[PDB]
Ligand binder design. Structure first.
Ligand SMILES: [Zn+2]
Ligand SMILES: [Zn+2]
Ligand SMILES: [Zn+2]
Lengths: 249, 249
């Protein structure tokens, strides 16, 4: 509506879209009118709490000097609205839905606290690629957290999976930072693009490993091996680009 | 009647309506002319005492700065006239009916004295919702008292039911006031309407518990639990309305 925050308008658009598509899905599923009304009110109730939490996070990011936290808040609201829509569609009771939303918010806070130092490190070196990698990691962690909360998992298994995912993300971040520093210093955008793409690949691999239930050590080892292979590919690409630049090509 | 106070005209209208419908009921019942005459004279005799007592209460309220007492006197007269009509219809003699009317008046005074501090507290904070809540509680107490007097109950059980009802009304009043203060301060009429409706619901629940014979502690516990549920509902509604206002909707 009129007179709002730049971050709040996007969240309002997301909420309206999710409500419209939830009504569409309820109509497709063929439910009674009272069931549809119950699902709609439950979804609105949960989405308001998710909206409040995400708006608080975005405002906290705005008050500091961290523009990344605004995007993290928007991502958090998007996936909280998705979780609320699925909870309403599944026909869960009000108390169970509220408890699930509370657990989701708490574990998202956990992931945010674990990811903040990486945001500080990325913003210290003024690396857009590192900030993009952190945002991608937060998005993947939000996906995994929402799926696990939907599946009905305890707060310990989810925390262990998040720990394994962060163990993989540490290696992915180190790989991306290494490549990106030399890509920026030598003034070769192809190296930066390679860094971002292969860091995203490493983050995807780490998330897939964490979902399978591996310990953080196994995730670290496998992400390290994949990073070594991608580092060999980077060596080839860097040699090619440097010789393109040196010869005037 | 040409001339008289504002509160007296409404009471006269109530008396005429009750007399007319009592005559209709007597005609429908198929009673002798002498029985109809004795019922009419008994009803008039009891209604005159009820009218005098309620008018005295109304003038007492009018002398001070308490407009609520005028409405409470009108309610007292209405229910006293109803009780007189039932006594006349039941064929009770001139002595048992008079004793029942006297007991009803004494217990109405008891309820009035117990409800006066809540009237003072409501008028101190200038809250129309709390005034309506006190009026509704007085009406429910009048209903219960008239029913118990007609059923032929001693002054001990009636009094115990009265304190049980007042124990429930204390929690109802606290809940309504807690919601109403924040609803008025934030300027959201929906919150005040919700407060009034849920306070009325809590008063109804307290009256139902008192009628069944539950002790005041059980009534207090049940009303407190229902208040917790309605408080969760209020939290949801307040969040929704606050986000409607903040986004310009
Ligand atoms: Zn808030
Ligand atoms: Zn290197
Ligand atoms: Zn409250």
């Amino acid at each position: 509506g009129p007179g709002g925050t730049m971050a709040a308008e996007e969240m309002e658009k997301i909420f309206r879209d999710k409500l419209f598509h939830l009504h569409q899905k309820l109509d497709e599923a063929g439910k009674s009118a009272e069931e549809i009304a119950k699902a709609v009110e439950l979804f609105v109730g949960l989405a308001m709490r998710a909206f409040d939490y995400a708006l608080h996070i975005a405002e906290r990011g705005k008050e500091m000097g961290i523009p990344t936290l605004v995007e993290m808040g928007k991502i958090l609201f998007k996936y909280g609205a998705k979780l609320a829509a699925e909870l309403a569609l599944a026909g869960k009771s009000e108390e169970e839905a509220r408890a699930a939303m509370d657990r989701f918010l708490s574990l998202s806070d956990y992931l945010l606290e674990r990811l903040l130092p990486y945001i500080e490190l990325a913003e210290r070196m003024k690396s857009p690629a590192l900030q993009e990698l952190v945002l991608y990691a937060f998005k993947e962690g939000m996906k995994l957290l929402a799926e696990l909360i939907l599946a009905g998992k305890s707060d310990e298994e989810i925390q262990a999976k998040l720990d394994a995912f962060l163990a993989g993300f540490d290696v992915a971040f180190e790989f991306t930072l290494d490549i990106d520093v030399i890509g920026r210093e030598l003034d070769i955008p192809e190296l930066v693009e390679f860094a971002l793409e292969k860091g995203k690949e490493l983050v995807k691999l780490a998330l897939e490993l964490a979902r399978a239930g591996k310990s953080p050590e196994e995730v670290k080892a496998a992400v390290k091996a994949r990073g070594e292979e991608l580092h060999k590919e980077f060596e080839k690409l860097a040699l090619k680009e440097y010789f393109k630049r040196r010869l005037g090509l």
